[PDB]
Structures are given as structure tokens and as C-alpha cells.
Design a protein around this ligand. Structure first.
Ligand SMILES: [Zn+2]
Length: 29
């Protein structure tokens, strides 16, 4: 199954980009 960022509900082609992408959520409000 694909991978969507429960944060920005953004989907990616790979979890990698997600895991990392999450690193950009360290401070997002
Ligand atoms: Zn996100």
C-alpha cells in the first residue's frame, strides 16, 4: 500500500520520502 503523511495527508512514492518528510514536521502548527 502507498504511503500518506497523516500530517499533511500527503502521499509519496516511497516511505523514505515520508519518514524524512516527517522530519519537516518537527515544528508545524
Ligand atoms: Zn506531512
Amino acid at each position: 500500500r502507498s504511503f500518506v503523511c497523516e500530517v499533511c495527508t500527503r502521499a509519496f512514492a516511497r516511505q523514505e520520502y515520508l519518514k524524512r518528510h516527517y522530519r519537516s514536521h518537527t515544528n508545524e502548527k
